[PDB]
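Fold this complex.
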Amino acid sequence: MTVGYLRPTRILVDQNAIYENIQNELKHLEGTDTVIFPVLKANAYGHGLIPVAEVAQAAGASGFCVALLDEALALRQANFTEPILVLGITQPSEIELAAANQISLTVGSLEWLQEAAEIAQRVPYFHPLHIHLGIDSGMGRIGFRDEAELLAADAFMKAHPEYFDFEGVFTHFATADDPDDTYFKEQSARFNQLVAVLPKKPRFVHVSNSATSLWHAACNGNVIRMGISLYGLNPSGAAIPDLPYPLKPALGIESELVFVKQVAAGSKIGYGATYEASEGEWIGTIPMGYADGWLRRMSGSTVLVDGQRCEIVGRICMDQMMIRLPKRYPVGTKVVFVGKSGDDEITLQELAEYADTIHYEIICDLSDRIPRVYTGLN
Amino acid sequence: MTVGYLRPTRILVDQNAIYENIQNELKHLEGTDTVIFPVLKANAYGHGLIPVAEVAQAAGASGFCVALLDEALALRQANFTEPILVLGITQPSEIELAAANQISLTVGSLEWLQEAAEIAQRVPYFHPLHIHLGIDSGMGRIGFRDEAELLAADAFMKAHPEYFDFEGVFTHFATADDPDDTYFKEQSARFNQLVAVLPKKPRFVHVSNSATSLWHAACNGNVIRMGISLYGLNPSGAAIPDLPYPLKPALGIESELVFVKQVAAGSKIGYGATYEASEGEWIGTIPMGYADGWLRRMSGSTVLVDGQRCEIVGRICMDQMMIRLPKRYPVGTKVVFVGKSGDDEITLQELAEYADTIHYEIICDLSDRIPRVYTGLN
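Structure:
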């Protein structure tokens, strides 16, 4: 958890980009009453929980979504007072913490409510929990999967208003970013069938991740759980290239050369001696490694130095890596991992493709050992 | 950086294991004057910088190695007073911080020393830096590669004792964990050749990572930079199971089921609907995802529940994943990712093999969102 402020490896977060992305979605929503609850789980997708919450609030966020009770508590402790929804399951033993901090909880079973009521009944002066019922419409993760148990949960909260405030109902789509919308339409029809058994809807009815808001807006309820698009990234990677408005990428990554040398032919570079240089090759060393989240699978990809693509050669080490340079550069020369250099640019999508993963994972894997530097809001 | 204390996902760190590992290497070293500087970079290989420093101190550590000046400063701020060596390059502009905190610095070029002296000359009351010259004997990472520059660096420090204390000289091996020792002996001969031309050796002369101390102990200098083996893990993965003393793995990983359901045939699970269930399959949901460092590449591997293997099915999500259960289990049932369950066990080496990487990366990629729980010392 030590932050490497003195090391010249940095994550750059453009808060103006985040502000514009959110404002564009608000514009996209005009003519409805739909509000935006930015999704800030996983340290705001690696961008930094509190700084992203600050700009999101300035940009017009009406509430927040997180993965864990601990993340919601962290927002409350930073003096945010908006509604906060924990999207994962919180065990019933923690309901007193949630109720005392007005944290809204996702509930996917009648059993959870029964257990929570047994606990709450023993708490003097208990104040009601704000509950969102999670409906599993085909993601298979958490939530109710039939009408009967859903209505039983609805009835149980009505029987115990001293413990439960039915605040929301929601589902999540597995394929809203798929060029084939067959399964999305199946899930949307299934959610609509299931929520139809509720005699009265709660104040929040929501289904939309970024992809749903971007490409299936007619299916929006009255909250957008805006995640990846807030950070300026296409939810689909490249599968659905066209967007209803432009996304401005918020995150860049930079470092510097800390060592530069020229080597003779056959010189072995890195662990396992897996790379052998050519004659007169220039090798640059960079203080970034797999402990920072630049995993060994990134060997053979390129960084940008002075507008030139430079291959990562040999094995990536825990804290350092080596690149092939086209000529001698001074120690301290900027290296661009993500972002623009010269007339070129390395995107998170292109890195995700090289790593055989998705950009969500690239940014979420960035270690807190790398300091985040923010533009501030113009 | 928000730690998930309320989530039932935890890393278990056995400090007694670390103590025994260090004590076994100390016994392995008896009859020499060699001391151990445990390597604590990357938050002590994901185990926790300060708790591992505390037990390593209790077990007989004489000093510490880290990757970054920031990590060394964190150790000083936790009131550790032993020598601390930064193994990576620290840029010359930070020498006042290293000098004011008695942090020893790796230096790999005469140019670094020249730039450092220009800075230090402008500092009233400057106190000398403790320098280790890093020699590149064939790793190709950082360090001197020729006799002339090394001797020029030695003479330059002697011209400026107000700024520099020549405290150590070292190299690092690329293939000390290789059953073939050919390149290892080439590096060792090359280092011995370069150090032989120093007019006088400094107080620390060191070459040894874990693999060197385990399988090439005759080549030890007077300090062991003990890394992975301190954490109970074989430096070679599975390439060299033959060890001089047993290693006790220090790290386990455990979670709980937060949701359990039985699904109909054809039910699709996870993002992209990539897994289709068979009739009556039991699906468990676990609050662990790729944002915690259980990356998407782990889909299809197994966890242990109640002594039985359970496949991670479908895509792993940012904060959650789904497994196939052999039968219904209660919510709250323990899940073992690393460690023992029943008559079975999952090791970090097995998981690294599944992930096409090394166990070093698995442990360094564990997010701080997972709390570490420590046994303490008997």
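Residues 113 and 308 of chain A are 59 Å apart (CA to CA).
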